[PDB]
Amino acid sequence: LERDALAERYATLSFDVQKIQRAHQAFSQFVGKHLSVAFDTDPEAEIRE
Amino acid sequence: IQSLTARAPVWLAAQDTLNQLCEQSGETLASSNDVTEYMQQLLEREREAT
Numbered sequence: 001l002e003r004d005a006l007a008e009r010y011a012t013l014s015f016d017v018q019k020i021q022r023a024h025q026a027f028s029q030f031v032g033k034h035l036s037v038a039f040d041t042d043p044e045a046e047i048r049e
Numbered sequence: 050i051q052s053l054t055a056r057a058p059v060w061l062a063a064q065d066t067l068n069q070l071c072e073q074s075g076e077t078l079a080s081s082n083d084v085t086e087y088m089q090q091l092l093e094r095e096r097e098a099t
Contacts, residue, residue, distance in 0.1 A: 024096060032089030036081050 071078045078084050 028089045028092045028096075031092065032085055033082075035085050035088070 067078070074087065076087055076090075078087060
């Protein structure tokens, strides 16, 4: 009965760690494919002008 | 010509520091997407090291 709780809690913690790791992977993929034009000014506006 | 000239020293400084940064790195850079690819590789290595 005691060890059941530890298994459950460990499951949640491992899930959280995996979530963080994948979030870092996503940001790395992003910057690999993205910075060339990141945060630049909106072209729709200027074309309209 | 004036626009190209105003952009000339900016371009030259870009190339200069690009060469310096390229030499500071083991891998040699050749294109913008290549630069960003190297950057994400650098982040990956940093994460593993920490």
